[PDB]
Amino acid sequence: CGCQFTSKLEGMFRDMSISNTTMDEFRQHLQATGVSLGGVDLTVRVLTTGYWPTQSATPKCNIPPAPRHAFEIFRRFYLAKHSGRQLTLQHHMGSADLNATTRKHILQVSTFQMTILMLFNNREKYTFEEIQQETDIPERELVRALQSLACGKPTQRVLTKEPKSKEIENGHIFTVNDQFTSKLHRVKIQTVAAKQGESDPERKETR
Amino acid sequence: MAAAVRQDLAQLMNSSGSHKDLAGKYRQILEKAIQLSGAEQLEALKAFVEAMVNENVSLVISRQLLTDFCTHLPNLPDSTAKEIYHFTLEKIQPRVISFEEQVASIRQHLASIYEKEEDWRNAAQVLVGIPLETGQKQYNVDYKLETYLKIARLYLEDDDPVQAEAYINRASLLQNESTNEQLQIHYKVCYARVLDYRRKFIEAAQRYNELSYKTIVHESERLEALKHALHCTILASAGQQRSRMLATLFKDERCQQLAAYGILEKMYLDR
Amino acid sequence: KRFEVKKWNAVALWAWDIVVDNCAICRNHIMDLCIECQANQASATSEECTVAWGVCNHAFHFHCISRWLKTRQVCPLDNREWEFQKYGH
């Protein structure tokens, strides 16, 4: 090809290069002490806005506490040793491992349901109203993220509810089941990425 | 009796129940703390602030009780309440991304208090700290314009151009979005003041002359703006633009009213 | 607690500002016109002279770096090196 979006790919790969350079320099940073904890095992990445698009709107959702501390530390570093540019927060991407606890099976949360798990860490037995009122949580993407732990789950359920039903209600309580059958210590719930057909909307807008 | 208030707050934090009942109990505790005075009231309100920012307390409960606390404080005079304002401003950092209306109100109140004690430097420092750009509260254009205007006005008497120049830049950036006519007039007055201050006496004279032929501006304020235009024109770099401005200013009769009437008469009529 | 977060794989986006209050080719300012236009009036039509932003985030008046690309040479910071990523501050 020529140079129209080959530069877009150049920047895309530049972003990965800068991400790994930042990863190794940050590893040197936490090798030299680190004061408090909360940065137990973190993987923060540096990507530019001119090569990774926003997606829809640059959302402004909330952040879980350990992720809050990680984002604050990364922002302080980027404003201290990479000054001249400020970060913008968005909510579409990422992942995390949720250490649950007869064995200790570690879960996986894709940056959306981990706010609900934050509210549960504070105190569980919440409901849809609790996670929609005190979270500043987005639209039905929230429903898809939440149904991952409860709806359509095999016999490794980690977020059980009393009103057993297919459709989602409002006043329904969440609990936890140990589920010793889930011997896997890195069980993940990959409800996202169900298809890759590129639904008409995005195709039409980019056309 | 601040220890009793702190113990009650700690016990209520671990209590389980409906949101309305907990909010009412916490509001009663806050009212009891306000009824105190001196160091006891200071420590009780500090404990209340610490409890509100605590992770355990509900989001709605925390935000609403901080709002009520911030509304009750202006009743207490300009005193150690300012110290607890600083303490609360420092306190809001784990939840500074969830709610910022309380932070913005605290910053505005602290800036007003500093302006009361002839302190534009510290009021400017406080009011700069507002995160207007974020949009996570999505402040309407009028509020951002008012905040930037206040910072620019504060910086004019603190005498620090660089940051006020950038703030005027951003106020102009978001300026062509706002609605209020009186706010626009105030912004134009402040911009003309900035132009007069920096070196832009000719541009300040132009802006003041443009604002002089207005209606909503007070006749006294219109006369003051015209006097500023006249003084800027006299002090401006003497050239073609200054000559044209002097010729234009030789038409207003309220120019003739002013004491510098003779001065620009001498300027334009050549001597 | 019953659930505890162990890892995180966040993606952090950033924006480029390097806000300053000066120019290069006209030596006046980021805003408030340039050498080739001087005043605000005299056939401006809402002042058709804005700030141009490059891919490297350097900021000039559009007219300034436009004539820079036109007058001396086009090779220095050509379409391969200098892009046009924004118009206005």
Ligand SMILES: [Zn+2]
């Ligand atoms: Zn220019």
Ligand SMILES: [Zn+2]
């Ligand atoms: Zn021009």
Ligand SMILES: [Zn+2]
């Ligand atoms: Zn450019």
